[PDB]
Amino acid sequence: VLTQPPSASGTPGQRVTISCSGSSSNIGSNTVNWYQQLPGTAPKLLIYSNNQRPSGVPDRFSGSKSGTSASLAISGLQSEDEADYYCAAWDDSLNWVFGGGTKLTVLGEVQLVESGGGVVQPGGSLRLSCAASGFRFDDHAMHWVRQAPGKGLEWVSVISGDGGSTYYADSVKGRFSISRDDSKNSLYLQMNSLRTEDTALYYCAKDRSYGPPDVFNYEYGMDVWGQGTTVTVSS
Amino acid sequence: PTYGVGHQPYRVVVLSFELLHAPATVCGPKKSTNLVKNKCVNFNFNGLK
Amino acid sequence: VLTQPPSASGSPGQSVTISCTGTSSDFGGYNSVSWYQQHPGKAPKLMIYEVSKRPSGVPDRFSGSKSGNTASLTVSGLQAEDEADYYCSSYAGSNNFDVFGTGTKVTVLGGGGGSEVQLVESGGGLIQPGGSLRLSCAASGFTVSSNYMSWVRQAPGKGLEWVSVIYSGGSTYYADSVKGRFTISRDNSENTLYLQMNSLRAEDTAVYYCARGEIQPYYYYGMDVWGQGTTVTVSS
Amino acid sequence: VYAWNRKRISNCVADYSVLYNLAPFFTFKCYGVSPTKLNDLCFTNVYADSFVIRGDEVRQIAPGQTGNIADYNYKLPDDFTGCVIAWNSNKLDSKVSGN
Amino acid sequence: EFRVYSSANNCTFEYVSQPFLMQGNFKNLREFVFKNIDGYFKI
Secondary structure, X not given: OEEOOOOOOOOOOOOOOOEEEEOOOOOOOOOOEEEEEOOOOOOEEEEEOOOEOOOOOOOOOEEEOOOOEEEEEOOOOOHHHOOEEEEEEEEOOOEEEEOOOEEOOOOOOOOOOEEOOXXXXXXXXXXXXXXXXXXXXXXXXXXXXXXXXXXXEEEEEEEOOOOOOEEEOOOOOOOEEEEOOOOOOEOEEEEOOOOOXXXXXXXXXXXXXXXXXXXXXXXXXXXXXXXXXOEOOOO | OOOOOOOOOEEEEEEEOXXXXXXXXXXXXXXXXXXXXXXXXXXXXXXXX | OOEOOOEOOOXXXXXXXXXXXXXXXXXXXXXXXXXXXEOOOOOOEEEEOOOOOOOOOOOOOXXXXXXXXXXXXXXXXXXXXXXXXXEEOOOOOOOOOOXXXXXXEOOOOOOOOOOOOOOOOOOOOOOOOOOOOOOEOOOOOOOOOOOOEEEEEEOOOOOOEEXXXXXXXXXXXXXXXXXXXXXXOOOOOOOOOEOOOOOOOOOOOOEEEEEOOOOOOOOOOXXXXXXXXXXXXXXX | OOXXXXXXXXXXXXXXXXXXXXXXXXXXXXXXXXHHHHOOOOEOOEEEEEEXXXXXXXXXXXXXOOOOOOOOOOOOOOOOOOEXXXXXXXXXXXXXXXX | OOOOOOOOOOOOOXXXXXXXXXXXXXXXXXXXXXXXXXXXXXX
16 A cells, blocks of 8 residues: 555646655565656656666656655656656565556656457456567566556556566456467466456556566566557446 | 576675674664754764763 | 477478477576487487487487577488487476477388386376375485486376476475475485375376486486386276 | 675674665665664674575575575575675676686 | 784674884883773773
C-alpha cells in the first residue's frame, strides 16, 4: 500500500512537490519508481532507482528518497507536464504495489504492441498475446501492467528474462499461467476463473533487467510501454 | 564480451556485522548542527542531553 | 522446449547434418552441447559432449561446430545402417529442467557399458498405483556417494527430460514435473543410493535411467556409463 | 569465490549513504535493518567479503540456501544482518583472450 | 625491526596515530599510568 495525493494542483512558473509515502517493507528496502502517463497515450518511464533518468526524460524532473517516502520535483513545469504520475515499489512479500495517480493539471525504437482482447463469455477467457521486433527478448523481463478505463494501474504478473521463476499478484495467483516460447519475441498469458472484474488494457510492459525483480533491488525498472488492446468482458 | 546478461561477471560484496563484548567503533555519520546565540534551547553535546 | 526436426532420412550420410535450433541465445554460459544416441533396447551411449574433442569411440562423427545459434553435428560420411534417435542438450540456465529435445528420427536406412562399472536396477514388474517403490543403481566401481548423478525418465514416443538432480551432499533439487511429490533419499554412503516413488500420480509410468553423471552440466568423468531401465507398468 | 577477501574494517564513520553514488550498483538488499536506520547503529568491526559470480547465481546468495555456489564456496547462516550489494562489471573484466 | 615477533595472524585492530607516545644534571622523569578498563586502556 502506497499513499499518494489523488488530485493535486499547481501554478505555472514555480515548482511543485509530489510525494509518495510507504512503509519500510516496500520503500525502505527497495527503490521507488515514478511513471508518467499522458491522457490518451501509452505510459512511459519517468524516474527509475530514484537517482538516474532515461535518455528521453530531460533534466526537468528529479526525485529523492529521504527516509521511507519518495519526493518528486519538477523545476519549471509547463503545459506539457500535465500528465498522471504513478508510484511503484516492489515489496519484500513478492508483490509489486503501484500508486493511485496524481492529477497534476494546470489550466495556464522497438514497438511493443500486443493484442488478444475482445469480449468473451464470462467464467472462461482466452490467451493474451504480445510481440516485438528484435529487442533481445532473452535478456529482458516482461510485466503485465493492466489499466482500467478511468482507474489507475496495477501489476498482474512478471516473467524474468531467463524464463524460470515467475511471479503473480495476490488476486491473480493460481488461475493465471504466464509463459514464453523458443520462437520469436512473444509472451503467452492464459487466464482462468473469470470473475468479470477484468475490464482493463493489460499492458505488455518491457523491462531492462534479466532476473525477477526480487534479487536486483537497484536495477529493476520498466522500458518503453506498448499499445495495448481494450478487452471489455462486461459479463 | 559478446554475450548476454545473466552469464556475465557480477561482483557481489557482503558486509557482515558483529556485536561482541567489545566497545563499538563503526557507528555511522555523526549528524551535527549549527551554533546558535544565547537562547533557551536544547543541547545534546556528545550525548549530554 | 527446444526445436528439432521430426525425422531425417533423405540423402543418408551425405547431407544429413542434423542440429537443434530454437536457442535464440549464446547457449547461456558454458557452451557444452551433448549428443545422446538413444537406441531401442540397451541404454543410450554418449557420442560427443563439447563442440570438439570427441571421446573414445567412433571417429567418423566429429566437427560439431556451433553455427548461428545451433550446434550442427556433422554426421555425413559416418555409415549407412543405423536405427536410433539423436538428442541434443542446451539451455544451460540455472535450475532449468527439460534440457533434452524432441524425437528426431535419424535412421539413415531404417530396415538394416556392460562390464565398465556396474548395472543393476529394481525390476518394478506390475507396479501398484501409489505406494512407495525404491530403485537403486548400486555401482561396485565408481563411488555412488561422491560423484554427481542424475535420474532421467523417458516414455514410449515422448522424449527424455530431467527428472532428478542430486549434488554431492547438500542439494536435493526436484524437477518441475513432480513439483514436490518426489522425495530423494540417499541410502548408506558405502553400499548404494536409491530413490523413492512417494505416491505417484499415474504419470511415472515412463522407464527410468540412473546416470552416473549430469546431463546439462556434464563433465568428462573418465567415461560415460549408463544402465538399462525397467518398465513401471502402472495399473491405475 | 574460493579465495575471497575478509577485510576487517573499523575505526571510521560508516556512511552508507555515500555507497548509493560510488558505482552503478544493481542490488542493494540489506537483510538486517533499513539503510536509513543503519546509519544510527554502532558496530565493532565490519567484515567485507567480495567475490565474482554469474548473474543467475546472484539469487543464490541468501542467508541460508542451497546451490552450486551457495553451499560450496560461500554460505550465509540465518543471522546475516548486512547487505548483498552486487553489480555487473562487464566493462573491464571481459576480453577475448581466454578467461 | 622485525626481531620482536616471529609470526602474524588476523589482526583485529591497529592504530595509525602519527605522534609518538613518548645538560649536566638535568635528567628526564617520565611516568605512564595504565589500567585494565574494558572500555579503553586509559593510557
